[PDB]
């Protein structure tokens, strides 16, 4: 990242029960990221934005669900999730 | 392929016909031979694959006039 790509990397926080439990207990925050966002681009984006210090980023790709309904077998988009751990003081 | 570099003669088809007139598809091939032709103006031997009629043309016209036609025809020797 060396451009306006910083604004196209993080798609938004993930609002699961596992996400909030991770935010409270540990200092990890689950974000939705672009499917072609590397772990380095996510770390830089969360540091430029949100003005925090990132300790480690782990990512995983999530398969979109199919839901064969209503004259055919549809399919939701594949999406990427990032677990972002900061320093203990920071809360993002 | 079985094509003469000088005359462009290639395989042609036709029939074998027996005494009872049974017809069999056959081919007629050119009398192709490999021959090295001396080129004085190049001080070099040029090996061509020619029919025996193509060799007669080189006798009548010369290798220089034949090779010039080969260059203009594109395909090289």
């Amino acid at each position: 990242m060396n451009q306006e790509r910083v604004f196209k990397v993080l798609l938004g926080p993930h609002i699961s029960e596992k996400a909030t439990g991770l935010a409270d207990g540990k200092s990890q925050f689950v974000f939705k990221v672009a499917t072609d966002a590397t772990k380095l681009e996510i770390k830089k984006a969360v540091e430029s934005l949100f003005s925090v210090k990132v300790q480690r980023v782990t990512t995983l790709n999530v398969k979109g669900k199919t839901k064969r309904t209503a004259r055919g077998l549809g399919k939701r988009n594949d999406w990427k999730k990032a677990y972002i751990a900061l320093q203990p003081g920071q809360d993002l | 392929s079985r094509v003469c570099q000088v005359t462009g003669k290639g395989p042609v088809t036709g029939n074998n016909i027996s005494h009872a007139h049974n017809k069999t598809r056959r081919r007629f091939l050119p009398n192709l031979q490999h021959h090295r032709f001396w080129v004085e103006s190049e001080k070099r031997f040029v090996r061509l694959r020619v029919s025996a009629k193509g060799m007669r043309i080189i006798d009548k016209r010369g290798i220089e006039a034949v090779l010039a036609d080969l260059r203009a025809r594109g395909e090289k020797f």
Partner: protein, 62 residues
């Protein structure tokens, strides 16, 4: 923002105008990802403004 007033500005001004619009788009994305975005026309209109800026930038700097 209409392209008429966009076409008056310089390349430098246009490039900061894009960076601002991209930050607004990013902020609108964060609001939408938590249900805290009351509007919805801003998402579509912010990306039309980015398209407008990029169109002028393409044709101004040939």
């Amino acid at each position: 923002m209409k392209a008429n007033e966009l076409r008056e500005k310089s390349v430098e001004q246009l490039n900061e105008q894009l960076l601002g619009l991209l930050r607004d788009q990013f902020n609108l994305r964060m609001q939408k990802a938590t249900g805290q975005l009351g509007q919805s026309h801003l998402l579509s209109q912010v990306k039309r403004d980015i398209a407008r800026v990029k169109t002028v930038l393409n044709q101004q700097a040939g």
